Design an enzyme around this catalytic site. Structure first.
Site, PDB file in Angstrom:
ATOM      1  N   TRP A 190       0.816  -1.143   0.065  1.00  0.00           N
ATOM      2  CA  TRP A 190      -0.022  -0.027   0.045  1.00  0.00           C
ATOM      3  C   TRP A 190       0.955   1.135   0.068  1.00  0.00           C
ATOM      4  CZ3 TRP A 190      -3.107   2.846   4.261  1.00  0.00           C
ATOM      5  CH2 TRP A 190      -4.312   3.187   3.701  1.00  0.00           C
TER       6      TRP A 190
HETATM    7  C1  LIG Z   1      -7.971   4.230   4.003  1.00  0.00           C
HETATM    8  C2  LIG Z   1      -8.310   5.558   4.306  1.00  0.00           C
HETATM    9  C3  LIG Z   1      -9.295   5.789   5.206  1.00  0.00           C
HETATM   10  C4  LIG Z   1      -9.686   7.204   5.661  1.00  0.00           C
HETATM   11  C5  LIG Z   1      -9.079   8.424   4.787  1.00  0.00           C
HETATM   12  C6  LIG Z   1      -7.978   8.179   3.764  1.00  0.00           C
HETATM   13  C7  LIG Z   1      -7.630   6.835   3.230  1.00  0.00           C
HETATM   14  C8  LIG Z   1      -6.420   6.592   2.466  1.00  0.00           C
HETATM   15  N1  LIG Z   1      -9.029   9.814   5.300  1.00  0.00           N
HETATM   16  S1  LIG Z   1     -10.388  11.012   4.124  1.00  0.00           S
HETATM   17  O1  LIG Z   1      -9.261  11.337   3.182  1.00  0.00           O
HETATM   18  O2  LIG Z   1     -10.919   9.943   3.116  1.00  0.00           O
HETATM   19  O3  LIG Z   1     -11.155  11.707   4.596  1.00  0.00           O
HETATM   20  C9  LIG Z   1      -9.730  10.066   6.666  1.00  0.00           C
HETATM   21  C10 LIG Z   1      -9.340  11.469   7.327  1.00  0.00           C
HETATM   22  O4  LIG Z   1      -8.635  12.054   6.878  1.00  0.00           O
HETATM   23  N2  LIG Z   1      -9.812  11.562   8.699  1.00  0.00           N
HETATM   24  C11 LIG Z   1     -10.778  10.635   9.432  1.00  0.00           C
HETATM   25  O5  LIG Z   1     -11.133  10.776  10.382  1.00  0.00           O
HETATM   26  N3  LIG Z   1     -11.171   9.515   8.704  1.00  0.00           N
HETATM   27  C12 LIG Z   1     -10.616   9.082   7.368  1.00  0.00           C
HETATM   28  N4  LIG Z   1     -10.751   7.791   7.090  1.00  0.00           N
HETATM   29  C13 LIG Z   1     -11.462   6.672   7.516  1.00  0.00           C
HETATM   30  C14 LIG Z   1     -10.569   6.057   8.784  1.00  0.00           C
HETATM   31  O6  LIG Z   1      -9.225   5.801   8.463  1.00  0.00           O
HETATM   32  C15 LIG Z   1     -11.958   4.807   8.956  1.00  0.00           C
HETATM   33  O7  LIG Z   1     -13.091   5.252   9.055  1.00  0.00           O
HETATM   34  C16 LIG Z   1     -11.306   4.121  10.149  1.00  0.00           C
HETATM   35  O8  LIG Z   1      -9.836   3.716  10.047  1.00  0.00           O
HETATM   36  C17 LIG Z   1     -12.393   2.753  10.162  1.00  0.00           C
HETATM   37  O9  LIG Z   1     -11.817   1.789  11.091  1.00  0.00           O
HETATM   38  P1  LIG Z   1     -12.135   0.290  11.198  1.00  0.00           P
HETATM   39  O10 LIG Z   1     -13.425  -0.108  10.825  1.00  0.00           O
HETATM   40  O11 LIG Z   1     -11.878  -0.095  12.921  1.00  0.00           O
HETATM   41  O12 LIG Z   1     -11.043  -0.354  10.281  1.00  0.00           O
HETATM   42  P2  LIG Z   1      -9.418  -0.326  10.576  1.00  0.00           P
HETATM   43  O13 LIG Z   1      -9.183  -0.362   9.074  1.00  0.00           O
HETATM   44  O14 LIG Z   1      -8.870   0.721  11.203  1.00  0.00           O
HETATM   45  O15 LIG Z   1      -9.179  -1.512  11.138  1.00  0.00           O
HETATM   46  C18 LIG Z   1      -9.582  -2.953  10.746  1.00  0.00           C
HETATM   47  C19 LIG Z   1      -8.492  -4.076  11.636  1.00  0.00           C
HETATM   48  O16 LIG Z   1      -9.075  -5.020  11.336  1.00  0.00           O
HETATM   49  C20 LIG Z   1      -7.788  -6.056  11.263  1.00  0.00           C
HETATM   50  N5  LIG Z   1      -8.340  -7.304  10.343  1.00  0.00           N
HETATM   51  C21 LIG Z   1      -8.939  -7.428   9.096  1.00  0.00           C
HETATM   52  N6  LIG Z   1      -9.527  -8.507   8.954  1.00  0.00           N
HETATM   53  C22 LIG Z   1      -8.864  -9.162  10.008  1.00  0.00           C
HETATM   54  C23 LIG Z   1      -9.048 -10.858  10.509  1.00  0.00           C
HETATM   55  N7  LIG Z   1      -9.651 -11.567   9.510  1.00  0.00           N
HETATM   56  N8  LIG Z   1      -8.465 -11.204  11.732  1.00  0.00           N
HETATM   57  C24 LIG Z   1      -7.778 -10.430  12.593  1.00  0.00           C
HETATM   58  N9  LIG Z   1      -7.748  -9.082  12.359  1.00  0.00           N
HETATM   59  C25 LIG Z   1      -8.264  -8.488  10.978  1.00  0.00           C
HETATM   60  C26 LIG Z   1      -6.989  -4.866  10.129  1.00  0.00           C
HETATM   61  O17 LIG Z   1      -5.598  -5.509  10.097  1.00  0.00           O
HETATM   62  C27 LIG Z   1      -6.996  -3.613  11.148  1.00  0.00           C
HETATM   63  O18 LIG Z   1      -5.971  -3.582  12.391  1.00  0.00           O
HETATM   64  S1  SF4 Z   2       4.722  -1.800   5.787  1.00  0.00           S
HETATM   65 FE1  SF4 Z   2       6.153  -1.443   4.019  1.00  0.00          FE
HETATM   66  S2  SF4 Z   2       5.659  -3.240   2.672  1.00  0.00           S
HETATM   67 FE2  SF4 Z   2       4.107  -3.065   4.046  1.00  0.00          FE
HETATM   68  S3  SF4 Z   2       2.360  -2.335   2.928  1.00  0.00           S
HETATM   69 FE3  SF4 Z   2       3.509  -0.609   4.243  1.00  0.00          FE
HETATM   70  S4  SF4 Z   2       4.971   0.221   2.589  1.00  0.00           S
HETATM   71 FE4  SF4 Z   2       4.354  -1.847   1.897  1.00  0.00          FE
END
Ligand SMILES: Cc1cc2c(cc1C)N(S(=O)(=O)O)[C@@H]1C(=O)NC(=O)N=C1N2C[C@H](O)[C@H](O)[C@H](O)COP(=O)(O)OP(=O)(O)OC[C@H]1O[C@@H](n2cnc3c(N)ncnc32)[C@H](O)[C@@H]1O
Ligand code: SF4
Ligand SMILES: Cc1cc2c(cc1C)N(S(=O)(=O)O)[C@@H]1C(=O)NC(=O)N=C1N2C[C@H](O)[C@H](O)[C@H](O)COP(=O)(O)OP(=O)(O)OC[C@H]1O[C@@H](n2cnc3c(N)ncnc32)[C@H](O)[C@@H]1O
Ligand code: SF4
Ligand code: SF4
Ligand code: SF4
Lengths: 149, 642, 642, 149
Positions: A47
């Site tokens: 990513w």
């Molecule tokens: C990707 C992204 C997202 C946003 C934005 C830009 C970009 C490029 N920008 S804006 O520019 O758009 O505006 C934002 C911003 O500036 N300000 C803000 O408040 N929010 C924004 N979001 C949104 C927030 O980030 C979002 O609302 C929250 O993070 C959502 O939280 P959550 O629903 O908890 O998802 P998470 O991704 O944080 O976590 C999920 C976890 O689950 C894990 N996981 C997944 N599957 C699993 C499995 N099978 N077993 C065990 N673990 C398993 C993940 O590893 C992670 O730890």
């Molecule tokens: S931690 Fe490094 S390898 Fe992993 S997604 Fe981020 S940039 Fe890519």
């Protein structure tokens, strides 16, 4: 995607854990037990979050923009500290930009999760109030919202 | 594509099982999950309850906030700590209108009345928030505040860790399926997973389970298919795991047809929130036309949505889609004119906002700054191209896809309580199973602060549920053993059929994860309103998608994996396939186009408020292998008028 | 994506050079090349001339006819050997109208008067042609005849081998650049290449060079981007090598904006010619509408082309595109209704046409039969989906892109002879350099028989040129050495910079062939009227394409290769990039939309016969790095009427 | 794409050349000197032309449909002879089809390129006539075409 510089990577063999392997959110960074050096095992799932780059104590990791749309030559290099982070952005044409941003206003590991909070009680467990409320919200009373008549 | 350096194969029967007993199990250590861990740790003391957090990666940087974020998108400000105070009623109205009239207002108002406290805690914990000389939080738009958030996730991870305790956090453990009460087909009993660092099968026995896995990405083919297939706008780390395990357990999904199509800087997908709201940037087509104005007329047909301010995001998208269909690309974000106008001739001011502009990227999507560098693009001199990415499924952002969850006793109307056996806040239709963040549907615009907050809400409710109902589900050992066999089946299949071909990845008896994923993306892209058809679809296309997904689901029984990394990729694929099926079935059920800009049903091109102003909820019955849908009419819960 | 098992690296100075002196050098051993080899061997005896054929693969199965073909698309039948006789005037009219008015009739009439003899030889040599009980060649449509052509290429390859002798055929030798006369800047003197089986650099010195490398594929991103990126409708083996070397040498290109978009069975791209013309299959949208009916009126604006019979292929595509834009997919080929209709209840008749239907696939595109097998599609029971593939650049099929070549003295009008220093049939603007098959532009609809025929024509012209002009080209040894260094530079660059990263394919100082190709495909797809925009483009998009292609071209100087196979891939990429640039510049130059269905200039949506009824020809000057364009008005050479 | 069955592949025993490696129009088939067995080196560049499949004397090569759009289970197997070719098509559902088509009406290697043709002459070199014309065209004379008045 991220890539490791063989000359700077020491396989974290002087540390308790491999930083890049430990930090990658998509489990891409791993060690080649042969060379005892890290590598990105699946670049098309990268990513380009730079987590591995920032956490490598040897600064051996950099990112080479995805080939699909990135001409060669560009680079973003961070130097993450404790209270701020420095960035150097180098253009394909040679232009170099330098920035510095704050990242934290308190010492690392200093958070006291429920500092100042009263102990939870069975009575409170039945209310809508979360830990520290209503005061952490900034109001003396729990915020009210008008329900439609 | 994946080419492992060497094999890491194990047979189910040779992998040791580690049983973990806990009261509350939180699956996913992202923003919502950390919020749940934090709050659960506080109330758990009332019953000496054990709280366990399981994360597939490392909490320090896992999930959507891995790179950090440039703003907190949800801060109401009821006291004036920011440049602009707002009211809760105005916020609820804002979210409902953006959803084109469909949002669970009891759930929205609920997280909104709590979110500011979360933000205040974030700052107290060390998160640097932008401030004016007068000390007020700097506003981006009306609801967001700018932050120096490079370490946003690490800070939140620290808080969760200090709260729950490191010994209660399991990292590098992938959860692939839930476990149900042996003596109650609609009650959760735990979950199963496996380590991606060693051969170890995990069996978690819990009284309450909270799904916090984030949304789903890579279901649709991206605009870049080589290395850049990794540059998904949304978190590539989230693969619809919660959606899969919850729907298999029988938890009802809602608004799963509501995907989100983000309009961002092209290819790198850098943020546009600051550029639009803060820098006052203009978006124009290849001929210098500001389409938000030239396409204003097309929005008049939508009443009252088209006259709302701000304009609903799907409608903003619709305007650019019309430009794309007319072939007026490239679409440009005129950063050069925005900076020049904001600076007003002051060179020092220019340097300052120039630095602010770069921080907006470097604190959240470095790839965009890298793209600019590689392409020699200086924002003060030339504009940047922008474009809508492929579809993503999530409930925390501008999309409201997720599980149908219960609301608070004081706000949820009887109309919305019918399907919940137990009325606990954020609990799904499956007893003891909660959903938060991306996993909780019908209450979007949560973002970072709101997701952490929703996790806190479910966490307190989970403790209340446990102490009040004294749940005590029993897992089915026979089911656990069958799941353990399934967990490692891909590795065993690889070993059993690899000898049919001289090439590991060209075998007639199995598909590797990347191969099944390429297939899924193509199916969804071509039949489920992907970029291939400019987000258009119809009944026939969706029906064909189901037929093709049927073939793929059957072939998942023939998945192979060469190492633990790929075994995880295998299950991540399984999770996406079912998520994709649910999405297609939902889009097929709703006979209208309520969110043009996100997707168009060419056979039902109009928005229908007469028969479709309802939430679409579905239930998958694993035993019968049948999907059932029902319509739940929207009712306005909070007082507000257009 | 390519992952070599082991390295195969060589430095230019370590590679031995093999010099080959010949009179006529034919580059490409496909259908046109074999036709040239065959005919050249006949006339060469007049001067004891040496004829050499160089092929990058093996002539037995190389090129577009590798799997064979199910029909010979060009057979006029001037005597009645088939079920339908035709005239040459009707054929010329047919081709010009299909080109929407733009075709070099002198060139078309020329291969047309010779093609039947070529077909008759093919049958004589063993090619089994379908025959009626009466002994007549079975017609597919009006101009094609059905054949049992699984061994079509091997048979033609044998004819060429018997004619020139195996000692004069060099296989597994990739030609990457032409050599020019040291004594004359606008004359060819040979070519350079390298073996893909061993470390050996080739220098071919010749008096005449004939380009027969086939067209160009994989310039545009395909509808399948995983393994199926390999399932290009046109020959994936042809990468615009002839276009590159010829344009670099200064030979003028013509109609390079004229790409071909094939409408075929979806994904597998099985042929539709037999189904449409022979089996009388109907194509209907998702709702059962036969769009060639419902969309007939929309062709009225294209008088008199739209009122032509058969309707021009680009206009047929346009009707398809209108259906796609309206969201009426899937589009189906109703094979089930066609077979039922044709059999008329006769079970034995059904079995027979059923075998014919499968042969149509098994003799030319097995993937389609395999697709049906994998998806359980039985043509007698259910229809198949169809769709247009990504664009391809070639001049032998329905596309007419290629080099501007001289015609026969008895047919070519003065209007078309102005740019040729020497007037020899099929010679380019560069003296001694000829172009045939896909490499010859402005005279399409040649297909297998016509391409072989055009090769024969050029071959005789080449012998005549040699005996009449008596050239004695001298190669520049200094340039040869520069080219040798360039040839293996990618391998030397890999060795020099691979130590910068622990991963061979993620390096900041070089790109591998597959990485550069993914980039090219994305650029062309998004800006040069690819599938991404439903074949639409405009000035701004094309201009941006040139900017991105400029970056890519510069990066080609940093290409790396790990083995001989990948070194060939590197040069094939180089060839494709220049071909792409030429295509973009040509599309940018023509300010009109003459072939809707193939591409749309949204900024100039109409066909303009007042200002653009001309061939667009261009010349690239390597020394100055400048492209020059010229408009050559079309003149009707043959007598015919709409 | 094509794939080699290890059990049937003998790396081409003692014959003079490796069939699959020799025939592939895109240079994909090659030998793994270690195993002495062939493999497709770059499957996403495979046109599925079946040339390798048809030419393998051991019938050790088959084709597995591109994963992008191919459910597992289908197969097309050719048995190419000298005058005809046989095909067996197996559907994912078990359905089996068998066909047989002619491929050549004359013995292989029997072509006499200019059989019956008169010898070329310098005079003939200046005309529009190709080898064998106008006789091979079958017309009463070289085909004439009307030029636009
Ligand atoms: C990707 C992204 C997202 C946003 C934005 C830009 C970009 C490029 N920008 S804006 O520019 O758009 O505006 C934002 C911003 O500036 N300000 C803000 O408040 N929010 C924004 N979001 C949104 C927030 O980030 C979002 O609302 C929250 O993070 C959502 O939280 P959550 O629903 O908890 O998802 P998470 O991704 O944080 O976590 C999920 C976890 O689950 C894990 N996981 C997944 N599957 C699993 C499995 N099978 N077993 C065990 N673990 C398993 C993940 O590893 C992670 O730890
Ligand atoms: S931690 Fe490094 S390898 Fe992993 S997604 Fe981020 S940039 Fe890519
Ligand atoms: C790909 C394809 C093509 C057709 C069709 C279906 C499909 C799926 N079908 S229908 O269904 O559409 O209708 C046809 C049909 O039924 N009947 C018919 O007559 N023609 C059809 N074509 C058209 C003909 O095949 C076509 O017109 C001729 O083959 C064109 O001949 P030529 O222009 O000579 O191209 P070639 O591909 O045969 O040969 C090129 C050679 O060059 C080699 N080569 C390339 N670059 C080289 C380099 N740099 N160095 C050395 N050698 C280097 C190639 O390896 C090959 O040997
Ligand atoms: S963190 Fe750096 S030094 Fe340590 S293994 Fe990774 S790349 Fe090598
Ligand atoms: S032709 Fe067959 S037996 Fe010979 S190397 Fe290739 S696959 Fe093996
Ligand atoms: S099927 Fe054709 S392209 Fe593929 S490996 Fe075999 S011979 Fe080569």
């Amino acid at each position: 995607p991220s890539f490791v510089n063989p000359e700077k990577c020491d396989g974290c063999k002087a540390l308790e854990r491999t930083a890049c392997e430990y930090i990658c959110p998509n489990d891409l960074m791993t060690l080649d037990k042969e060379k005892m050096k890290a590598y990105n095992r699946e670049p098309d799932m990268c990513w380009e979050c730079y987590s591995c780059v920032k956490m490598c104590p040897q600064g051996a990791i950099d990112v080479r923009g995805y080939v699909d749309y990135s001409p060669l030559g560009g680079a973003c290099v961070p130097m993450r500290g404790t209270s701020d982070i420095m960035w150097t952005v180098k253009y394909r044409n040679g232009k170099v930009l330098r920035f510095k941003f704050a990242i934290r206003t308190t010492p690392w590991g200093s958070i006291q999760p429920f500092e100042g909070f009263p102990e939870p009680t069975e009575e409170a467990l039945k209310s809508e109030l979360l830990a520290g409320e209503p005061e952490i919200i900034g109001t003396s009373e729990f915020p009210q919202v008008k329900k439609k008549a | 594509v994946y080419y492992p350096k060497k094999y890491e194969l194990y047979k189910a029967d040779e992998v040791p099982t580690e049983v973990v007993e806990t009261d509350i199990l939180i699956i996913g250590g992202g923003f919502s999950g950390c919020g749940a861990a934090y709050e659960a740790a506080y109330w758990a003391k009332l019953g000496g309850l054990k709280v366990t957090l399981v994360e597939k990666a490392a909490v320090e940087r896992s999930g959507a906030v891995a790179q950090g974020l440039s703003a907190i998108n949800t801060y109401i400000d009821l006291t004036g700590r920011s440049e602009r105070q707002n009211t809760l009623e105005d916020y609820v109205r804002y979210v409902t209108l953006d959803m084109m009239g469909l949002a669970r207002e009891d759930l929205v108002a609920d997280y909104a009345r709590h979110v500011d406290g979360t933000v205040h805690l974030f700052e107290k914990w060390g998160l640097p928030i932008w401030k004016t000389p007068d000390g007020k939080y700097v506003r981006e738009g009306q609801w967001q505040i700018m932050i120096h958030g490079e370490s946003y996730k690490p800070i939140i991870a620290e808080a969760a860790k200090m709260a729950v305790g490191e010994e209660n956090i399991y990292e590098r453990v992938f959860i692939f399926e839930l476990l149900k009460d042996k003596n109650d087909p609609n009650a959760v009993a735990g979950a199963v997973g496996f380590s991606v660092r060693e051969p170890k099968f995990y069996v978690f026995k819990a009284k309450a389970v909270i799904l916090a896995t984030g949304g789903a990405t890579l279901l649709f083919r991206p605009r870049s298919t080589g290395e850049a297939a990794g540059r998904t706008w949304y978190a590539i780390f989230d693969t619809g795991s919660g959606y899969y395990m919850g729907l298999k357990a029988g938890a009802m999904l809602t608004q799963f047809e509501h995907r989100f199509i983000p309009f961002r800087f092209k290819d790198g997908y850098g943020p546009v929130g600051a550029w639009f709201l803060f820098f006052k940037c203009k978006a124009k087509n290849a001929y210098g036309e500001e389409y938000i104005k030239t396409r204003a007329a097309e929005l008049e047909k939508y009443k009252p949505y088209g006259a709302a301010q701000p304009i609903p995001t799907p409608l903003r998208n619709h305007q650019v889609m019309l430009e794309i269909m007319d072939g007026n690309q490239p679409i440009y974000m005129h950063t050069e004119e925005a900076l020049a106008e904001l600076a007003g001739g002051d060179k020092k001011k220019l340097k300052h906002i120039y630095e602010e502009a770069f921080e907006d990227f470097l604190d959240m999507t470095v790839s965009q700054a890298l793209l600019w560098a590689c392409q020699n693009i200086d924002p003060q001199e030339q504009p940047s191209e922008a474009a809508p990415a492929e579809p993503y499924i999530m409930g925390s952002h501008s999309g409201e896809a997720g599980f149908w969850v219960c609301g608070p006793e004081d706000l949820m109307p009887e109309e919305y309580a019918k399907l919940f056996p137990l009325k606990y806040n954020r609990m799904t239709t499956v007893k003891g199973l909660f959903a938060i963040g991306d996993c909780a549907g019908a209450n979007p615009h949560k973002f970072s602060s709101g997701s952490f907050t929703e996790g806190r809400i479910a966490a307190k409710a989970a403790v209340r549920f446990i102490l009040e109902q004294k749940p005590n589900p029993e897992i089915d050992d026979a089911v656990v053993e069958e799941l353990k066999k399934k967990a490692y089946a891909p590795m065993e299949r690889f070993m059993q059929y690899k000898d049919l071909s001289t090439a590991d990845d060209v075998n007639p008896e199995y598909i590797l994860p990347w191969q099944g994923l390429v297939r899924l993306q193509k199916i969804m892209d071509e039949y489920a309103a992907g970029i291939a058809t400019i987000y258009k679809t119809n009944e026939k296309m969706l029906q064909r998608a189901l037929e093709l997904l049927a073939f793929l689901k059957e072939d998942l029984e023939k998945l192979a994996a060469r190492d633990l990394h790929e075994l995880m990729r295998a299950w991540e694929l399984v999770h996406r396939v079912w998520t994709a099926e649910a999405h297609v079935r939902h889009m097929l059920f709703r006979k209208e186009t309520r969110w043009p800009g996100y997707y168009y049903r060419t056979d039902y091109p109009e928005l229908n408020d007469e028969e479709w102003k309802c939430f679409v909820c579905s239930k998958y019955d694993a035993e019968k292998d049948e999907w059932t849908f029902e319509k739940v009419p929207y009712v306005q819960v909070i007082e507000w008028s257009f």
